Design a protein around this ligand. Structure first.
Ligand SMILES: NC(=O)c1ccc[n+]([C@@H]2O[C@H](COP(=O)([O-])OP(=O)(O)OC[C@H]3O[C@@H](n4cnc5c(N)ncnc54)[C@H](OP(=O)(O)O)[C@@H]3O)[C@@H](O)[C@H]2O)c1
Length: 315
């Protein structure tokens, strides 16, 4: 299978194109190339500020008859400065207008902590301390549910949520639309076994980002573990006549976890979806899963002492 069926029975393609850090002058071509290589799932966000260029790409391929709207799975995300409901509606309409779409397939809460509204994405006081808001992810969810009832969003999900936080959402008084995905960092050094088990058992599909360990991240350090250099992955890649990246991506697909590798490089965009023509052995999967060290590269870490930080819990 190339998809995972969500609680709603909508089909989410297991491989999607990631866009975080794709420059605005390069992302239009990457998305065009992806569509031509058969990608149908596209992950974008308000805070990536490249949604307009993604939307141009999608519109051009629809107009060319290369792909039908109903066969695309477009995801975007609400940024934490926009949890308040009126602000949420303006942010969403901008994300929908930029993408030139009539509806999103999936709209996610980007992070679970709310951040102070204003122009900046990461508001700070004079000390350089990040400023939080009074709006919670619960508060934001109530706003987002209206979008579903309106037909503007097919389904809602979460990103960077721990299982306690999802429980809280699932137990929210008056809940109307249950979350359909949790999108979180996932690779052999952060396997997510317990979180994936919990989501799957709760009607929620998982979406794994940073499958290649995000080597273009801005704060990479020499002392960080290097996903793309794991020695067992080269071994397994060679045996399957695949690349190291293809093994790292397959690792998710084979767990029925969707995965959104980001590239703006034509050869790599093509390579990354070439993962439905081989199968990792039980020993291969057992060996990859062995590598877990609970090591994360991604997240808003400066807010670790504020309420609703996700990464202190085991999962
Ligand atoms: N908080 C969240 O919810 C969250 C957080 C992080 C990411 N995301 C999403 O997940 C996506 C994936 O995460 P990521 O962007 O952090 O990292 P990633 O996808 O793991 O890695 C991207 C990097 O790997 C390179 N690359 C891609 N394909 C490759 C290949 N076959 N071989 C070698 N290198 C390759 C890219 O270079 P080129 O681009 O130059 O080719 C880029 O530098 C993001 O774009 C975004 O859509 C969401």
């Amino acid at each position: 299978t190339t998809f995972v069926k969500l609680r709603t029975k909508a089909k989410m393609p297991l491989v999607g194109l990631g866009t975080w850090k794709s420059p605005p002058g390069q992302v239009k071509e990457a998305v065009k190339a992806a569509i031509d290589a058969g990608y149908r799932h596209f992950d974008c966000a308000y805070v990536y500020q490249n949604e307009s260029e993604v939307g141009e790409a999608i519109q051009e391929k629809i107009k060319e008859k290369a792909v039908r709207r109903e066969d695309l799975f477009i995801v975007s995300k609400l940024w934490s400065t926009f949890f308040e409901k009126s602000l949420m509606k303006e942010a969403f309409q901008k994300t929908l207008s930029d993408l030139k779409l009539d509806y999103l397939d999936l709209y996610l809460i980007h992070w679970p902590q709310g951040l102070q509204a204003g122009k900046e994405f990461l508001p700070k006081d004079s000390q350089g301390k990040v400023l939080m808001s009074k709006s919670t992810f619960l508060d934001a969810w109530e706003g987002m549910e209206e979008l579903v009832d309106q037909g503007l969003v097919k389904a809602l999900g979460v990103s960077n949520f721990n299982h306690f936080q999802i429980e809280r959402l699932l137990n929210k008084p008056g809940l109307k639309h249950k979350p359909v995905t949790n999108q979180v960092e996932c690779h052999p050094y952060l396997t997510q076994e317990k979180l994936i088990q919990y989501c799957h058992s709760k009607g929620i599909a998982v979406i794994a980002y940073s499958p290649l360990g995000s080597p273009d991240r801005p704060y990479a350090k020499p002392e960080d573990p290097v996903v793309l250099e794991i020695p067992k992955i080269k071994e397994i890649a060679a045996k399957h006549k695949k690349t190291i990246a293809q093994v790292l991506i397959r690792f998710h697909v084979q767990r029925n976890v969707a995965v959104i590798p980001k590239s703006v490089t034509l050869s790599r965009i093509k390579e990354n979806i070439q993962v439905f023509d081989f199968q990792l052995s039980e020993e291969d999967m057992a060996a990859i899963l062995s590598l877990n060290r609970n090591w994360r590269a991604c997240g808003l870490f400066v807010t670790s002492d504020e309420e609703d930080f996700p990464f202190h819990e085991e999962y």
